[PDB]
DNA sequence: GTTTATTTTATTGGTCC
DNA sequence: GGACCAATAAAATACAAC
């Protein structure tokens, strides 16, 4: 477990966001492009779409 | 909206009992006080964080 | 100004090709 | 092996009551 959790920068929130806004799902190249662009890890990158994909579902509220 | 004096009780009842809370107690405990499952889970998530604020009671 | 409920990283364990 | 899902926790926030 242990893995303390760290809040991501704006600048790379954002970032992550406009991406997102482009494609649900994100290539395995794009990844790469995606985390140099802001120092993230690729694993870390694939969990916040993993993780984005659920917000989105819970806007199912709305 | 405040949870019951009584609820309380039993939360913290069970809490001693266990930190964490197995799914099959949940049931018991979240019809035993009527609530929610996700409100009982909620409450445990923020109690354990209570006990890290211990500042000698 | 102090004392329930939502949102955000993050790992775990299931699937499906 | 890689991608996806959901369940679940902890840290960080937020917002109401009091």
Redesign the pocket.
């Known amino acids: ?8 920068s704006k600048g790379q ?1 954002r970032e ?1 966001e406009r991406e997102y806004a482009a494609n ?3 290539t ?1 190249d794009k ?1 790469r492009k995606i985390s140099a662009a802001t120092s ?5 990158i ?6 984005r ?3 989105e ?2 806007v199912l509220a709305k």
Do not use: A, D, H
Not at 1 to 8: A, C, N, S, V
Not at 40 to 44: A, H, K
Not at 46 to 51: A, S, V
């Open positions: 477990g242990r893995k303390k959790r760290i809040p991501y929130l992550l649900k799902f994100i395995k990844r993230l890890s690729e694993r870390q694939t969990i916040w779409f993993q993780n994909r659920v917000k579902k819970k």
